[PDB]
Amino acid sequence: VQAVAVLKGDAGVSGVVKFEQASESEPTTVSYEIAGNSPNAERGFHICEFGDATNGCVSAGPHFNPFKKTHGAPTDEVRHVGDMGNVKTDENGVAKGSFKDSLIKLIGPTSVVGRSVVIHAGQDDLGKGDTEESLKTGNAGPRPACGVIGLTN
């Protein structure tokens, strides 16, 4: 199965996020290319519960967390499903990369199809911040761009 999200906003940030999962049990390969970020920085990259763009990136809601856990790093046992960590940006402010994740799926009851991918203005502290905000958003700040995850060929 294949999915795609086109990140857009009015803050100059934009990109594309592709998703690939053969079967439910197999991890999903996430591939991204996002431009217009701050150069040489780490930016929060998350999947939110709703694919609702009626009010900018805010209507996407909280991080997808069907199991009601706290915010963590993608390598953590305790993390939200939509916790993909931080993406690195180069000297030109472009973040290009790829990775696999076993909690993010395009098939089954926890499918992210129809939900939103969000890129942050700030760095995700990965839940290690000494605040309770850290346990929900990683204190990653504003959402300059987002896109609904749709199905593709």
4 or 140: CB nearest its own copies = 4
91 makes contact, choosing from its own copies, Cu ion, Cl ion, none, with CB < 5 to 8 Å by partner type, with none
Is 98 one of the binding residues for its own copies (CB under 8 A)? Answer: no
46 or 105: CB nearest Cu ion = 46
Q: Least CB distance from residue 146 to Cl ion, whole Å? A: 9
Is 101 one of the binding residues for Zn ion (CB under 5 A)? Answer: no
In sequence order, the β-bridge partners of residue 83 are 46
Q: Least CB distance from residue 50 to Zn ion, whole Å? A: 14
Question: Three-state SS string across the chain, please?
Answer: CEEEEEEECCCCCEEEEEEECCCCCCCEEEEEEEECCCCCCEEEEEEECCCCCCCCCHHHCCECCCCCCCCCCCCCCCCCCCEEEEEECCCCCCEEEEEEECCCCCCCCCCCCCCEEEECCCCCCCCCCCCCCCCCCCCCCCCCEEEECEECC
Instruction: Please give the residues from 103 up to 142 whose contact with its own copies meets the rule CB under 8 A.
Output: 113-116
Residues that bind Cl ion (CB under 5 A): 46, 118
Residues that bind its own copies (CB under 8 A): 3-4, 6, 16, 49-54, 59, 61, 113-116, 147-153
